[PDB]
Amino acid sequence: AEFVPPPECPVFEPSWEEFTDPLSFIGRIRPLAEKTGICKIRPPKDWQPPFACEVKSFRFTPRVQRLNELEAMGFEQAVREYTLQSFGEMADNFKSDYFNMPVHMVPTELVEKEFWRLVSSIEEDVIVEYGADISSKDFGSGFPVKDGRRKILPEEEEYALSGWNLNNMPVLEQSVLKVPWLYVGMCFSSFCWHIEDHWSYSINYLHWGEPKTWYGVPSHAAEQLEEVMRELAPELFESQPDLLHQLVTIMNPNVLMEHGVPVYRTNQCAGEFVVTFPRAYHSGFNQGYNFAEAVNFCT
Numbered sequence: 001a002e003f004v005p006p007p008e009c010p011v012f013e014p015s016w017e018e019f020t021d022p023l024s025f026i027g028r029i030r031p032l033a034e035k036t037g038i039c040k041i042r043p044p045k046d047w048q049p050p051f052a053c054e055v056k057s058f059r060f061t062p063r064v065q066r067l068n069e070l071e072a073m074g075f076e077q078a079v080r081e082y083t084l085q086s087f088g089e090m091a092d093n094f095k096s097d098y099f100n101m102p103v104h105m106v107p108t109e110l111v112e113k114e115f116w117r118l119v120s121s122i123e124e125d126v127i128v129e130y131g132a133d134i135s136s137k138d139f140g141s142g143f144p145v146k147d148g149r150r151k152i153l154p155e156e157e158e159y160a161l162s163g164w165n166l167n168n169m170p171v172l173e174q175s176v177l178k179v180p181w182l183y184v185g186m187c188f189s190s191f192c193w194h195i196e197d198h199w200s201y202s203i204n205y206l207h208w209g210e211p212k213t214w215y216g217v218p219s220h221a222a223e224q225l226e227e228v229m230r231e232l233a234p235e236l237f238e239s240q241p242d243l244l245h246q247l248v249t250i251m252n253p254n255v256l257m258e259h260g261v262p263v264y265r266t267n268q269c270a271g272e273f274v275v276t277f278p279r280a281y282h283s284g285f286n287q288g289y290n291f292a293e294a295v296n297f298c299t
């Protein structure tokens with residue numbers, strides 16, 4: 001049976017007045033978005049920050065991902081070093097060869113349907129690479145920053161100072177007595193179901209490239225998801241602590257939905273934000289070559 005797409009999560013298109021600061025805006029949409037776990041935010045059309053990464057020196061060794069590693073229960077090691085350009089050439093070549101069509105012509109529903117088929121397939125072993133958890137301290141943030149390590153044009157200063165610049169999000173949690181991370185995706189590269197440390201918010205910006213497909217669960221269903229996950233996880237992993245079990249928490253959203261867990265989806269396109277709410281489980285995969293930046297923040 002083919003994959004059944006979950007219902008779409010909320011998308012907000014704030015006016016320039018509503019777009020003044022993200023913390024106030026997120027607070028206002030909370031009564032709705034908290035009930036879906038994730039939401040998408042489309043900035044005004046004229047809000048277009050420039051890409052400020054040091055592309056000439058951008059080099060990384062992505063992690064290798066075998067889509068059916070869990071159902072299939074011979075080592076592929078992270079030895080291939082890429083540049084942004086060489087990874088993109090590999091990524092586009094992989095996708096165009098896999099689907100036998102230009103990368104921009106593959107429907108998002110088809111990649112989604114094929115991703116979940118491959119995750120459970122025992123006869124077909126598809127292996128991809130993900131440039132995940134690249135620190136913005138290594139080659140700079142995708143957003144312009146007033147660091148002095150790179151030049152900022154006068155038309156770019158407003159983005160260096162914008163509250164929607166992920167480098168300007170509040171990250172200090174209140175108690176008695178962090179930098180954004182970068183993600184260089186390719187088709188089928190993915191992240192498993194998880195929540196954030198300290199049940200923190202997270203905000204995610206797709207700088208460019210093909211969409212990032214998300215799945216989200218509202219926080220009121222967090223314990224229901226955890227029960228389903230442990231009931232259906234392999235018995236060898238069933239008793240592992242949450243922080244370790246999250247390393248293998250691959251699960252088809254339809255399986256969660258069949259067990260009563262509400263799940264929402266979205267395709268995050270270039271230039272759009274995705275916000276995850278406290279204790280909102282989320283997962284996803286990339287439709288193709290793209291570049292994302294993310295940070296956890298607190299209210």
Ligand SMILES: *CC(=O)Nc1cccc([C@@H](OCCN2CCCCC2)c2cc3nccc(C(=O)O)c3s2)c1
Nearest residue numbers: 132133181183190191192246247248249250292294
């Ligand atoms: C099962 C599995 O392998 N899951 C997986 C794979 C790759 C990367 C990640 C995870 O990266 C760790 C997050 N990082 C920052 C926070 C502290 C721990 C280290 C990812 C988590 C998210 N969350 C939202 C979006 C994305 C994304 O766009 O890739 C990711 S990646 C988990």
Ligand SMILES: [Mn+2]
Nearest residue numbers: 194195196202
């Ligand atoms: Mn996350």
